[PDB]
């Protein structure tokens, strides 16, 4: 029972790990997009400042 609970808890952890791992992949991909969007934004904003200077 400790072993079944262990395999199960290991799976609670493995599944929780699969889920956090899925989430870690999502944070890495989304946060990378956050930063790319933020960088694209910084770019758009820097371009905006120049576009406004151009305006």
């Amino acid at each position: 029972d400790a072993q079944e609970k262990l395999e199960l808890a290991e799976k609670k952890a493995t599944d929780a790990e699969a889920d956090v791992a899925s989430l870690n992949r999502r944070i890495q991909l989304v946060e990378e997009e956050l930063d790319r969007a933020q960088e694209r934004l910084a770019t758009a904003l820097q371009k905006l400042e120049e576009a406004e200077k151009a305006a």
């Binding site: 960088e39 820097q46 120049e50 200077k53």
Partner: protein, 375 residues
């Protein structure tokens, strides 16, 4: 994987290589001109690995590689590495063999002649291309930008050429070439980042510095005033993420690097900068040419993407130029990619379909033919 035997176009320089099919509006393969080699002894068995890594492989596995470029200030000195870069770019990424297509390669007008002699030879002898044409980069810039007339200031990775063209003709006596380039700007930045406490001495580190420059640096319209502020306040610093999770913040170094293009003395070069060479090329052209060249200062190549550069160039040139005269900067979105775009435009012209050296004219004459047929 294309269904037509169009000419292939490939702007392969000292930095990056851009390639695609003639007639399109963008390169399809954009890779570094790099062949990487391990600087470590393999320890584990059955690890795969390469003898050498090419293009994106070279940067992807760079943590243990020394990375070399085959092209030095515009000239190929290592054509074995070029064959691998071209093979990868053409066969693996563009999905085409030159064997079934004419190919267009590019070079500055005063690029040493051996450069054209080898680009022609490798495509005819190792890739069996049916035809070849080495193009002038300034020509391609003018086609890409919608011009026949202007000064092409090509700010390259290894060299700045600077050539005036009027009505499609070169004015070669007015070429003002400088040993001032994007690669020197990178070297300058790492020395000043060392001053800040962040030393970069290995290839992986060199690559980081080039990445910092490309994402964080700018010129703005007035350097000395921008530096007076950046040197006085933290509000001008920008953070960059280093590969190991650590960060570097960069202050006035953010612009001192790009500024070398206007102040070459920053890297020990005996030059007045890119705006003065643009001006001198106009100045040495005939008086009835000058007005059209002042109205058309044409950007080509990279570094043209620094915030404030199109405007910095117009400002610095109008400051040297005479009054009454109109000084304009041509700084199209086809920046850094304008040589490739021009290659596509030139290759697709009906007036250019008789210009490639055939695999017959080449076989009879040898590679010296490039100077009889291309430029």
């Amino acid at each position: 994987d294309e269904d037509e035997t169009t000419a292939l176009v490939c702007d392969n320089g000292s930095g990056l290589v851009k390639a695609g099919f003639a007639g399109d509006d963008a390169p399809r393969a954009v890779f570094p001109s790099i062949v990487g080699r391990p600087r470590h002894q393999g320890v584990m068995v059955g690890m795969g690995q390469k003898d050498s890594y090419v293009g994106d492989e070279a940067q992807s596995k760079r943590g243990i590689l020394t990375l070399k470029y085959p092209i030095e200030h515009g000239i190929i000195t290592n054509w074995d590495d070029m064959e691998k870069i071209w093979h990868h770019t053409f066969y693996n990424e563009l999905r085409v063999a030159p064997e079934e297509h004419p190919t267009l390669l590019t070079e500055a007008p005063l690029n040493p002649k051996a450069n054209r002699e080898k680009m022609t030879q490798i495509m005819f002898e190792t890739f069996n291309v049916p035809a070849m044409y080495v193009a002038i980069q300034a020509v391609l810039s003018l086609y890409a930008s919608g011009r026949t007339t202007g000064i092409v200031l090509d700010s390259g990775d290894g060299v700045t050429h600077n050539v005036p063209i009027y009505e499609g003709y070169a004015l070669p006596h007015a070429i003002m070439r400088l040993d001032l380039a994007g690669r020197d700007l990178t070297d300058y930045l790492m020395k000043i980042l060392t001053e800040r406490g962040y030393s970069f001495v290995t290839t992986a580190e060199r690559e980081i510095v080039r990445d910092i420059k490309e994402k964080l640096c700018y010129v703005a319209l007035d350097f000395e005033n921008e530096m007076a502020t950046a040197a006085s306040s933290s509000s001008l610093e920008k953070s960059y993420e280093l590969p190991d999770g650590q960060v570097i913040t960069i202050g006035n170094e953010r612009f001192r690097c790009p500024e070398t293009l206007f102040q070459p003395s920053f890297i020990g070069m005996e030059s007045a900068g890119i705006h003065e060479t643009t001006y001198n090329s106009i100045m040495k052209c005939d008086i009835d040419i000058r007005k059209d060249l002042y109205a058309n200062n044409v950007m080509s190549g990279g570094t043209t993407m620094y915030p404030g550069i199109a405007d910095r160039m117009q400002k610095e040139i109008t400051a040297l130029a005479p009054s009454t005269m109109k000084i304009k900067i041509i700084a199209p979105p086809e920046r850094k990619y304008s040589v490739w775009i021009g290659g596509s435009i030139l290759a697709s012209l009906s007036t250019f379909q008789q210009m490639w050296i055939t695999k017959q004219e080449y076989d009879e004459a040898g590679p010296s033919i490039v100077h009889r047929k291309c430029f």
